């Protein structure tokens, strides 16, 4: 009982189940590439905006810690991923003692 309006719209077809395009799996982790970033961050270190963040992130609050990263890293969807990986290195420093 088809109809162009509602909740199951349109002319009904049957979907062609296929492999994704190779370009669409693009920004992936690929463990050799993960090795290069993770080895170099101990010979390079931490930026000064993300050391002042993690002295706020280990004692005081997380609401001033995300608001701080909001002012220095642009958006909100960027400033939580940064807030949650500074905190996972912070537990690999603190709780892994």
């Amino acid at each position: 009982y088809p109809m162009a309006v509602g909740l199951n719209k349109g002319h009904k077809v049957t979907k062609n189940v296929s492999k994704p395009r190779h370009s669409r799996r693009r920004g992936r982790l690929t463990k050799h590439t993960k090795f290069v970033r993770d080895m170099i961050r101990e010979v390079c270190g931490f930026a000064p905006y993300e050391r002042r963040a993690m002295e706020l992130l280990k004692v005081s609050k997380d609401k001033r810690a995300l608001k701080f990263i909001k002012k220095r890293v642009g958006t909100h969807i960027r400033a939580k991923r940064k807030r949650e990986e500074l905190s996972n290195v912070l537990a690999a420093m603190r709780k892994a003692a």
């Binding site: 090795f35 080895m39 170099i40 101990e42 010979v43």
Partner: protein, 117 residues
């Protein structure tokens, strides 16, 4: 120090890479044994030191290197600065020798910045 560098550059001297002179006559002596014997495998492995940072770093991270000699006065340091931290994790023993041009004379070139057994 200069005693340890000399014991090292002596051992790196008889593992010198192939110059173009002997490359000419190794391919003459290869064809004249195919004209003689037609062997399946004349040499099991020809031993040599690999030179070059993009060559060395592939060998360090596969742990196929024995000893990585790394230079001293490389003009941008960022070409080289990772590799002492990289040899420590992979378990390859590394050493800093004075002068990028002195181990570049092992390889018949001007500078070569890294050699590795």
């Amino acid at each position: 120090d200069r005693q340890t560098a000399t014991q090292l550059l002596k051992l790196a001297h008889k593992y010198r890479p192939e110059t173009k002179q002997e490359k000419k006559q190794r391919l003459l002596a290869r064809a004249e044994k195919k004209a003689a014997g037609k062997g399946d495998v004349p040499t099991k492995r020809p031993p040599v030191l690999r030179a070059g940072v993009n060559t060395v770093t592939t060998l360090v991270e596969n742990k196929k290197a024995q000893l990585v000699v790394i230079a001293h006065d490389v003009d941008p340091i960022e070409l080289v600065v990772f590799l002492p931290a990289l040899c420590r994790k992979m378990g390859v023993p590394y050493c800093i020798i004075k002068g990028k041009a002195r181990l570049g004379r092992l390889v018949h070139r001007k500078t070569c910045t890294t050699v590795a057994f």
